[PDB]
Amino acid sequence: MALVLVKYGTDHPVEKLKIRSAKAEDKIVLIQNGVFWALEELETPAKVYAIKDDFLARGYSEEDSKVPLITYSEFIDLLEGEEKFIG
Amino acid sequence: MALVLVKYGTDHPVEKLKIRSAKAEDKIVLIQNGVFWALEELETPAKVYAIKDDFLARGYSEEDSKVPLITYSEFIDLLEGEEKFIG
């Protein structure tokens, strides 16, 4: 149930095995240079999300993702995760 | 400690007291139509942030907001915290 924040890509390759070692409960966010990992294979049982808007900001096509693309709105839905007393 | 999310415009009465009765140790995020709370006279001891990218997307200006705005990058860092143990 760990939060994995990736804001690194290719210039930093250690996040790939972080993603590998991530658990089913854990959350993986690809932001900034993390969009490069959306083109990777990535052996992960965790919940992987790449920022769709930032992905587009980096100049990449949404078709060209191996991972799920979400917007900041859905990032807050991730931020919620469950339900709590938020609503 | 508590993660407080608001994203139901002003149509959700419970949003007010979530902010209102928050602790000075908690985090409060305004997202989507929740940005309307960023314009009012909300008084909370918690860390209150409205999403800048989303707020500007509403057609408003940074100057319009009363509370601090964070960007997609800063939102990721919010969820990190400050200490970043992601090495």
PDB file of all heavy atoms in Angstrom, chain A residues 5-37:
ATOM      1  N   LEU A   5       5.797   7.540  -6.687  1.00  0.00           N
ATOM      2  CA  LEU A   5       5.742   8.698  -7.549  1.00  0.00           C
ATOM      3  C   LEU A   5       6.950   8.725  -8.460  1.00  0.00           C
ATOM      4  O   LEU A   5       8.079   8.886  -8.003  1.00  0.00           O
ATOM      5  CB  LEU A   5       5.687   9.971  -6.701  1.00  0.00           C
ATOM      6  CG  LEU A   5       4.332  10.263  -6.057  1.00  0.00           C
ATOM      7  CD1 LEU A   5       4.437  11.464  -5.136  1.00  0.00           C
ATOM      8  CD2 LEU A   5       3.279  10.511  -7.124  1.00  0.00           C
ATOM      9  N   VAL A   6       6.719   8.559  -9.748  1.00  0.00           N
ATOM     10  CA  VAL A   6       7.806   8.598 -10.695  1.00  0.00           C
ATOM     11  C   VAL A   6       7.765   9.893 -11.480  1.00  0.00           C
ATOM     12  O   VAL A   6       6.820  10.163 -12.222  1.00  0.00           O
ATOM     13  CB  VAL A   6       7.761   7.402 -11.669  1.00  0.00           C
ATOM     14  CG1 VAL A   6       8.953   7.431 -12.612  1.00  0.00           C
ATOM     15  CG2 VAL A   6       7.716   6.084 -10.906  1.00  0.00           C
ATOM     16  N   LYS A   7       8.803  10.683 -11.311  1.00  0.00           N
ATOM     17  CA  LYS A   7       8.995  11.881 -12.097  1.00  0.00           C
ATOM     18  C   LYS A   7      10.423  11.874 -12.603  1.00  0.00           C
ATOM     19  O   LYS A   7      11.217  12.781 -12.351  1.00  0.00           O
ATOM     20  CB  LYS A   7       8.673  13.130 -11.260  1.00  0.00           C
ATOM     21  CG  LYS A   7       9.277  13.113  -9.861  1.00  0.00           C
ATOM     22  CD  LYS A   7       8.673  14.190  -8.964  1.00  0.00           C
ATOM     23  CE  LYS A   7       8.989  15.592  -9.460  1.00  0.00           C
ATOM     24  NZ  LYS A   7       8.795  16.619  -8.398  1.00  0.00           N
ATOM     25  N   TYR A   8      10.707  10.825 -13.356  1.00  0.00           N
ATOM     26  CA  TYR A   8      12.019  10.504 -13.849  1.00  0.00           C
ATOM     27  C   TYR A   8      11.815   9.598 -15.037  1.00  0.00           C
ATOM     28  O   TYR A   8      10.866   8.816 -15.066  1.00  0.00           O
ATOM     29  CB  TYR A   8      12.856   9.746 -12.813  1.00  0.00           C
ATOM     30  CG  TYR A   8      13.150  10.488 -11.529  1.00  0.00           C
ATOM     31  CD1 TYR A   8      12.459  10.196 -10.359  1.00  0.00           C
ATOM     32  CD2 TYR A   8      14.134  11.462 -11.480  1.00  0.00           C
ATOM     33  CE1 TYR A   8      12.741  10.854  -9.179  1.00  0.00           C
ATOM     34  CE2 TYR A   8      14.420  12.129 -10.307  1.00  0.00           C
ATOM     35  CZ  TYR A   8      13.723  11.821  -9.157  1.00  0.00           C
ATOM     36  OH  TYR A   8      14.014  12.476  -7.978  1.00  0.00           O
ATOM     37  N   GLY A   9      12.674   9.702 -16.007  1.00  0.00           N
ATOM     38  CA  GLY A   9      12.542   8.866 -17.179  1.00  0.00           C
ATOM     39  C   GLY A   9      13.810   8.779 -17.987  1.00  0.00           C
ATOM     40  O   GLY A   9      14.332   9.804 -18.416  1.00  0.00           O
ATOM     41  N   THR A  10      14.284   7.546 -18.184  1.00  0.00           N
ATOM     42  CA  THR A  10      15.478   7.217 -18.987  1.00  0.00           C
ATOM     43  C   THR A  10      16.774   7.794 -18.401  1.00  0.00           C
ATOM     44  O   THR A  10      17.758   7.072 -18.241  1.00  0.00           O
ATOM     45  CB  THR A  10      15.323   7.591 -20.486  1.00  0.00           C
ATOM     46  OG1 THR A  10      15.141   9.003 -20.672  1.00  0.00           O
ATOM     47  CG2 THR A  10      14.142   6.838 -21.089  1.00  0.00           C
ATOM     48  N   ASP A  11      16.770   9.078 -18.065  1.00  0.00           N
ATOM     49  CA  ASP A  11      17.886   9.696 -17.356  1.00  0.00           C
ATOM     50  C   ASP A  11      18.037   9.045 -15.986  1.00  0.00           C
ATOM     51  O   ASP A  11      19.113   9.035 -15.392  1.00  0.00           O
ATOM     52  CB  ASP A  11      17.640  11.195 -17.196  1.00  0.00           C
ATOM     53  CG  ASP A  11      18.789  11.912 -16.515  1.00  0.00           C
ATOM     54  OD1 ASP A  11      19.808  12.175 -17.184  1.00  0.00           O
ATOM     55  OD2 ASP A  11      18.668  12.238 -15.314  1.00  0.00           O
ATOM     56  N   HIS A  12      16.931   8.508 -15.500  1.00  0.00           N
ATOM     57  CA  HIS A  12      16.904   7.746 -14.268  1.00  0.00           C
ATOM     58  C   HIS A  12      16.127   6.455 -14.532  1.00  0.00           C
ATOM     59  O   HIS A  12      14.925   6.496 -14.781  1.00  0.00           O
ATOM     60  CB  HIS A  12      16.247   8.573 -13.158  1.00  0.00           C
ATOM     61  CG  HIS A  12      16.869   8.396 -11.806  1.00  0.00           C
ATOM     62  ND1 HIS A  12      18.144   8.825 -11.503  1.00  0.00           N
ATOM     63  CD2 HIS A  12      16.381   7.851 -10.667  1.00  0.00           C
ATOM     64  CE1 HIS A  12      18.413   8.547 -10.241  1.00  0.00           C
ATOM     65  NE2 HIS A  12      17.360   7.958  -9.714  1.00  0.00           N
ATOM     66  N   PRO A  13      16.822   5.304 -14.565  1.00  0.00           N
ATOM     67  CA  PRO A  13      16.231   4.023 -14.935  1.00  0.00           C
ATOM     68  C   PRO A  13      15.859   3.113 -13.755  1.00  0.00           C
ATOM     69  O   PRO A  13      15.323   2.021 -13.962  1.00  0.00           O
ATOM     70  CB  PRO A  13      17.368   3.397 -15.738  1.00  0.00           C
ATOM     71  CG  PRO A  13      18.629   3.925 -15.113  1.00  0.00           C
ATOM     72  CD  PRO A  13      18.258   5.159 -14.316  1.00  0.00           C
ATOM     73  N   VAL A  14      16.118   3.554 -12.530  1.00  0.00           N
ATOM     74  CA  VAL A  14      15.928   2.696 -11.360  1.00  0.00           C
ATOM     75  C   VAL A  14      14.443   2.569 -11.004  1.00  0.00           C
ATOM     76  O   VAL A  14      14.021   1.633 -10.321  1.00  0.00           O
ATOM     77  CB  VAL A  14      16.739   3.210 -10.141  1.00  0.00           C
ATOM     78  CG1 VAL A  14      16.210   4.544  -9.640  1.00  0.00           C
ATOM     79  CG2 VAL A  14      16.759   2.180  -9.020  1.00  0.00           C
ATOM     80  N   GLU A  15      13.645   3.496 -11.497  1.00  0.00           N
ATOM     81  CA  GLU A  15      12.214   3.484 -11.244  1.00  0.00           C
ATOM     82  C   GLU A  15      11.547   2.287 -11.914  1.00  0.00           C
ATOM     83  O   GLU A  15      10.483   1.851 -11.483  1.00  0.00           O
ATOM     84  CB  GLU A  15      11.537   4.788 -11.694  1.00  0.00           C
ATOM     85  CG  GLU A  15      12.389   5.693 -12.573  1.00  0.00           C
ATOM     86  CD  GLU A  15      13.544   6.320 -11.820  1.00  0.00           C
ATOM     87  OE1 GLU A  15      13.310   7.236 -11.013  1.00  0.00           O
ATOM     88  OE2 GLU A  15      14.692   5.874 -12.021  1.00  0.00           O
ATOM     89  N   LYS A  16      12.185   1.732 -12.941  1.00  0.00           N
ATOM     90  CA  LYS A  16      11.613   0.591 -13.641  1.00  0.00           C
ATOM     91  C   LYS A  16      11.537  -0.630 -12.727  1.00  0.00           C
ATOM     92  O   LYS A  16      10.539  -1.350 -12.739  1.00  0.00           O
ATOM     93  CB  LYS A  16      12.388   0.260 -14.924  1.00  0.00           C
ATOM     94  CG  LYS A  16      11.820  -0.950 -15.657  1.00  0.00           C
ATOM     95  CD  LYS A  16      12.139  -0.946 -17.146  1.00  0.00           C
ATOM     96  CE  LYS A  16      13.623  -1.112 -17.427  1.00  0.00           C
ATOM     97  NZ  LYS A  16      13.872  -1.375 -18.870  1.00  0.00           N
ATOM     98  N   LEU A  17      12.567  -0.862 -11.917  1.00  0.00           N
ATOM     99  CA  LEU A  17      12.518  -1.982 -10.987  1.00  0.00           C
ATOM    100  C   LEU A  17      11.787  -1.600  -9.700  1.00  0.00           C
ATOM    101  O   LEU A  17      11.382  -2.473  -8.931  1.00  0.00           O
ATOM    102  CB  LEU A  17      13.899  -2.647 -10.715  1.00  0.00           C
ATOM    103  CG  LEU A  17      15.087  -1.797 -10.215  1.00  0.00           C
ATOM    104  CD1 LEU A  17      15.586  -0.831 -11.277  1.00  0.00           C
ATOM    105  CD2 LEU A  17      14.750  -1.067  -8.926  1.00  0.00           C
ATOM    106  N   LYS A  18      11.596  -0.298  -9.472  1.00  0.00           N
ATOM    107  CA  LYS A  18      10.685   0.151  -8.419  1.00  0.00           C
ATOM    108  C   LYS A  18       9.271  -0.269  -8.792  1.00  0.00           C
ATOM    109  O   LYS A  18       8.529  -0.809  -7.976  1.00  0.00           O
ATOM    110  CB  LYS A  18      10.730   1.672  -8.235  1.00  0.00           C
ATOM    111  CG  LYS A  18      12.070   2.209  -7.767  1.00  0.00           C
ATOM    112  CD  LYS A  18      12.019   3.718  -7.571  1.00  0.00           C
ATOM    113  CE  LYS A  18      13.379   4.293  -7.201  1.00  0.00           C
ATOM    114  NZ  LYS A  18      13.904   3.726  -5.931  1.00  0.00           N
ATOM    115  N   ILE A  19       8.928  -0.026 -10.053  1.00  0.00           N
ATOM    116  CA  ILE A  19       7.648  -0.437 -10.613  1.00  0.00           C
ATOM    117  C   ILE A  19       7.504  -1.960 -10.558  1.00  0.00           C
ATOM    118  O   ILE A  19       6.425  -2.482 -10.274  1.00  0.00           O
ATOM    119  CB  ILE A  19       7.509   0.064 -12.073  1.00  0.00           C
ATOM    120  CG1 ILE A  19       7.461   1.595 -12.103  1.00  0.00           C
ATOM    121  CG2 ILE A  19       6.277  -0.520 -12.748  1.00  0.00           C
ATOM    122  CD1 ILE A  19       7.434   2.175 -13.503  1.00  0.00           C
ATOM    123  N   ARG A  20       8.606  -2.664 -10.808  1.00  0.00           N
ATOM    124  CA  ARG A  20       8.617  -4.126 -10.749  1.00  0.00           C
ATOM    125  C   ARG A  20       8.342  -4.629  -9.336  1.00  0.00           C
ATOM    126  O   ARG A  20       7.602  -5.597  -9.141  1.00  0.00           O
ATOM    127  CB  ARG A  20       9.968  -4.682 -11.195  1.00  0.00           C
ATOM    128  CG  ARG A  20      10.294  -4.474 -12.660  1.00  0.00           C
ATOM    129  CD  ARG A  20      11.648  -5.081 -12.984  1.00  0.00           C
ATOM    130  NE  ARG A  20      12.017  -4.932 -14.390  1.00  0.00           N
ATOM    131  CZ  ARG A  20      11.909  -5.903 -15.294  1.00  0.00           C
ATOM    132  NH1 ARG A  20      11.352  -7.064 -14.962  1.00  0.00           N
ATOM    133  NH2 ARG A  20      12.356  -5.715 -16.526  1.00  0.00           N
ATOM    134  N   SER A  21       8.951  -3.975  -8.357  1.00  0.00           N
ATOM    135  CA  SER A  21       8.885  -4.426  -6.976  1.00  0.00           C
ATOM    136  C   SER A  21       7.639  -3.883  -6.278  1.00  0.00           C
ATOM    137  O   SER A  21       7.396  -4.176  -5.105  1.00  0.00           O
ATOM    138  CB  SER A  21      10.151  -3.992  -6.231  1.00  0.00           C
ATOM    139  OG  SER A  21      10.291  -4.676  -4.996  1.00  0.00           O
ATOM    140  N   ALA A  22       6.849  -3.102  -6.999  1.00  0.00           N
ATOM    141  CA  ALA A  22       5.618  -2.555  -6.453  1.00  0.00           C
ATOM    142  C   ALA A  22       4.605  -3.668  -6.215  1.00  0.00           C
ATOM    143  O   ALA A  22       4.584  -4.668  -6.936  1.00  0.00           O
ATOM    144  CB  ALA A  22       5.049  -1.497  -7.381  1.00  0.00           C
ATOM    145  N   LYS A  23       3.789  -3.503  -5.193  1.00  0.00           N
ATOM    146  CA  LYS A  23       2.823  -4.521  -4.802  1.00  0.00           C
ATOM    147  C   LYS A  23       1.436  -4.193  -5.341  1.00  0.00           C
ATOM    148  O   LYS A  23       1.185  -3.077  -5.787  1.00  0.00           O
ATOM    149  CB  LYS A  23       2.803  -4.642  -3.278  1.00  0.00           C
ATOM    150  CG  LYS A  23       4.145  -5.075  -2.712  1.00  0.00           C
ATOM    151  CD  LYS A  23       4.206  -4.931  -1.203  1.00  0.00           C
ATOM    152  CE  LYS A  23       5.538  -5.430  -0.669  1.00  0.00           C
ATOM    153  NZ  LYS A  23       5.673  -5.222   0.795  1.00  0.00           N
ATOM    154  N   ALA A  24       0.536  -5.171  -5.282  1.00  0.00           N
ATOM    155  CA  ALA A  24      -0.806  -5.037  -5.851  1.00  0.00           C
ATOM    156  C   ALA A  24      -1.574  -3.865  -5.244  1.00  0.00           C
ATOM    157  O   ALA A  24      -2.439  -3.271  -5.896  1.00  0.00           O
ATOM    158  CB  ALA A  24      -1.586  -6.329  -5.659  1.00  0.00           C
ATOM    159  N   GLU A  25      -1.249  -3.534  -4.001  1.00  0.00           N
ATOM    160  CA  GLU A  25      -1.920  -2.451  -3.290  1.00  0.00           C
ATOM    161  C   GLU A  25      -1.387  -1.096  -3.735  1.00  0.00           C
ATOM    162  O   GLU A  25      -2.094  -0.089  -3.676  1.00  0.00           O
ATOM    163  CB  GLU A  25      -1.685  -2.564  -1.784  1.00  0.00           C
ATOM    164  CG  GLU A  25      -1.912  -3.942  -1.199  1.00  0.00           C
ATOM    165  CD  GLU A  25      -1.512  -3.990   0.260  1.00  0.00           C
ATOM    166  OE1 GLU A  25      -0.334  -3.694   0.560  1.00  0.00           O
ATOM    167  OE2 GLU A  25      -2.367  -4.299   1.113  1.00  0.00           O
ATOM    168  N   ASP A  26      -0.139  -1.089  -4.181  1.00  0.00           N
ATOM    169  CA  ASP A  26       0.608   0.149  -4.366  1.00  0.00           C
ATOM    170  C   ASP A  26       0.097   0.954  -5.552  1.00  0.00           C
ATOM    171  O   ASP A  26      -0.599   0.436  -6.431  1.00  0.00           O
ATOM    172  CB  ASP A  26       2.103  -0.139  -4.545  1.00  0.00           C
ATOM    173  CG  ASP A  26       2.709  -0.894  -3.375  1.00  0.00           C
ATOM    174  OD1 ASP A  26       2.073  -0.953  -2.297  1.00  0.00           O
ATOM    175  OD2 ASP A  26       3.821  -1.434  -3.528  1.00  0.00           O
ATOM    176  N   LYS A  27       0.473   2.221  -5.572  1.00  0.00           N
ATOM    177  CA  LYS A  27       0.052   3.136  -6.618  1.00  0.00           C
ATOM    178  C   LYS A  27       1.282   3.649  -7.348  1.00  0.00           C
ATOM    179  O   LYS A  27       2.255   4.040  -6.711  1.00  0.00           O
ATOM    180  CB  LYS A  27      -0.698   4.329  -6.010  1.00  0.00           C
ATOM    181  CG  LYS A  27      -1.791   3.955  -5.016  1.00  0.00           C
ATOM    182  CD  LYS A  27      -2.926   3.172  -5.662  1.00  0.00           C
ATOM    183  CE  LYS A  27      -4.060   2.938  -4.672  1.00  0.00           C
ATOM    184  NZ  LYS A  27      -5.191   2.185  -5.277  1.00  0.00           N
ATOM    185  N   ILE A  28       1.245   3.647  -8.669  1.00  0.00           N
ATOM    186  CA  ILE A  28       2.372   4.129  -9.453  1.00  0.00           C
ATOM    187  C   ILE A  28       1.938   5.262 -10.372  1.00  0.00           C
ATOM    188  O   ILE A  28       1.072   5.085 -11.229  1.00  0.00           O
ATOM    189  CB  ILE A  28       3.006   3.000 -10.295  1.00  0.00           C
ATOM    190  CG1 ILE A  28       3.445   1.848  -9.387  1.00  0.00           C
ATOM    191  CG2 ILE A  28       4.191   3.534 -11.093  1.00  0.00           C
ATOM    192  CD1 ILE A  28       4.015   0.664 -10.139  1.00  0.00           C
ATOM    193  N   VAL A  29       2.545   6.422 -10.181  1.00  0.00           N
ATOM    194  CA  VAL A  29       2.227   7.595 -10.978  1.00  0.00           C
ATOM    195  C   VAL A  29       3.380   7.954 -11.907  1.00  0.00           C
ATOM    196  O   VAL A  29       4.507   8.156 -11.458  1.00  0.00           O
ATOM    197  CB  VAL A  29       1.913   8.811 -10.083  1.00  0.00           C
ATOM    198  CG1 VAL A  29       1.695  10.061 -10.924  1.00  0.00           C
ATOM    199  CG2 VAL A  29       0.697   8.531  -9.208  1.00  0.00           C
ATOM    200  N   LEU A  30       3.092   8.023 -13.198  1.00  0.00           N
ATOM    201  CA  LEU A  30       4.071   8.470 -14.177  1.00  0.00           C
ATOM    202  C   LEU A  30       3.803   9.923 -14.553  1.00  0.00           C
ATOM    203  O   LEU A  30       2.813  10.228 -15.225  1.00  0.00           O
ATOM    204  CB  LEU A  30       4.044   7.589 -15.437  1.00  0.00           C
ATOM    205  CG  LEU A  30       4.586   6.162 -15.282  1.00  0.00           C
ATOM    206  CD1 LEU A  30       5.966   6.177 -14.648  1.00  0.00           C
ATOM    207  CD2 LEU A  30       3.634   5.294 -14.475  1.00  0.00           C
ATOM    208  N   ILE A  31       4.677  10.812 -14.103  1.00  0.00           N
ATOM    209  CA  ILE A  31       4.554  12.235 -14.386  1.00  0.00           C
ATOM    210  C   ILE A  31       5.884  12.772 -14.923  1.00  0.00           C
ATOM    211  O   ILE A  31       6.951  12.249 -14.585  1.00  0.00           O
ATOM    212  CB  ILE A  31       4.116  13.022 -13.115  1.00  0.00           C
ATOM    213  CG1 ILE A  31       3.946  14.515 -13.403  1.00  0.00           C
ATOM    214  CG2 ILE A  31       5.090  12.816 -11.968  1.00  0.00           C
ATOM    215  CD1 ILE A  31       2.701  14.839 -14.191  1.00  0.00           C
ATOM    216  N   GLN A  32       5.808  13.781 -15.792  1.00  0.00           N
ATOM    217  CA  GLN A  32       6.989  14.424 -16.371  1.00  0.00           C
ATOM    218  C   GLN A  32       7.734  13.440 -17.278  1.00  0.00           C
ATOM    219  O   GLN A  32       7.175  12.932 -18.249  1.00  0.00           O
ATOM    220  CB  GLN A  32       7.924  14.967 -15.273  1.00  0.00           C
ATOM    221  CG  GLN A  32       7.216  15.798 -14.213  1.00  0.00           C
ATOM    222  CD  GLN A  32       8.169  16.427 -13.216  1.00  0.00           C
ATOM    223  OE1 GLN A  32       9.250  15.905 -12.948  1.00  0.00           O
ATOM    224  NE2 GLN A  32       7.761  17.543 -12.640  1.00  0.00           N
ATOM    225  N   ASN A  33       8.984  13.145 -16.939  1.00  0.00           N
ATOM    226  CA  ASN A  33       9.787  12.208 -17.718  1.00  0.00           C
ATOM    227  C   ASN A  33       9.300  10.777 -17.521  1.00  0.00           C
ATOM    228  O   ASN A  33       9.783   9.849 -18.169  1.00  0.00           O
ATOM    229  CB  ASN A  33      11.270  12.323 -17.345  1.00  0.00           C
ATOM    230  CG  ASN A  33      11.944  13.511 -17.997  1.00  0.00           C
ATOM    231  OD1 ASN A  33      11.579  13.919 -19.098  1.00  0.00           O
ATOM    232  ND2 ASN A  33      12.944  14.070 -17.334  1.00  0.00           N
ATOM    233  N   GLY A  34       8.326  10.607 -16.636  1.00  0.00           N
ATOM    234  CA  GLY A  34       7.757   9.297 -16.398  1.00  0.00           C
ATOM    235  C   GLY A  34       6.995   8.777 -17.603  1.00  0.00           C
ATOM    236  O   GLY A  34       6.728   7.582 -17.704  1.00  0.00           O
ATOM    237  N   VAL A  35       6.658   9.677 -18.529  1.00  0.00           N
ATOM    238  CA  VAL A  35       5.925   9.304 -19.737  1.00  0.00           C
ATOM    239  C   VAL A  35       6.733   8.345 -20.613  1.00  0.00           C
ATOM    240  O   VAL A  35       6.175   7.633 -21.444  1.00  0.00           O
ATOM    241  CB  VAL A  35       5.531  10.540 -20.574  1.00  0.00           C
ATOM    242  CG1 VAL A  35       4.621  11.463 -19.775  1.00  0.00           C
ATOM    243  CG2 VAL A  35       6.768  11.284 -21.059  1.00  0.00           C
ATOM    244  N   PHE A  36       8.049   8.321 -20.417  1.00  0.00           N
ATOM    245  CA  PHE A  36       8.920   7.429 -21.178  1.00  0.00           C
ATOM    246  C   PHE A  36       8.697   5.977 -20.771  1.00  0.00           C
ATOM    247  O   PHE A  36       8.943   5.059 -21.551  1.00  0.00           O
ATOM    248  CB  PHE A  36      10.390   7.809 -20.979  1.00  0.00           C
ATOM    249  CG  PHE A  36      10.796   9.064 -21.699  1.00  0.00           C
ATOM    250  CD1 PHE A  36      10.787  10.289 -21.050  1.00  0.00           C
ATOM    251  CD2 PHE A  36      11.185   9.020 -23.028  1.00  0.00           C
ATOM    252  CE1 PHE A  36      11.157  11.444 -21.712  1.00  0.00           C
ATOM    253  CE2 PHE A  36      11.558  10.171 -23.695  1.00  0.00           C
ATOM    254  CZ  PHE A  36      11.544  11.386 -23.037  1.00  0.00           C
ATOM    255  N   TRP A  37       8.210   5.774 -19.554  1.00  0.00           N
ATOM    256  CA  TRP A  37       7.965   4.431 -19.048  1.00  0.00           C
ATOM    257  C   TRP A  37       6.661   3.879 -19.601  1.00  0.00           C
ATOM    258  O   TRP A  37       6.400   2.682 -19.529  1.00  0.00           O
ATOM    259  CB  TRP A  37       7.943   4.423 -17.518  1.00  0.00           C
ATOM    260  CG  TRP A  37       9.236   4.876 -16.912  1.00  0.00           C
ATOM    261  CD1 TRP A  37       9.436   5.989 -16.152  1.00  0.00           C
ATOM    262  CD2 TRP A  37      10.511   4.235 -17.032  1.00  0.00           C
ATOM    263  NE1 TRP A  37      10.754   6.075 -15.783  1.00  0.00           N
ATOM    264  CE2 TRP A  37      11.435   5.012 -16.310  1.00  0.00           C
ATOM    265  CE3 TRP A  37      10.961   3.078 -17.673  1.00  0.00           C
ATOM    266  CZ2 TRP A  37      12.780   4.671 -16.215  1.00  0.00           C
ATOM    267  CZ3 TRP A  37      12.298   2.741 -17.579  1.00  0.00           C
ATOM    268  CH2 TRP A  37      13.194   3.535 -16.854  1.00  0.00           C
TER     269      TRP A  37
END
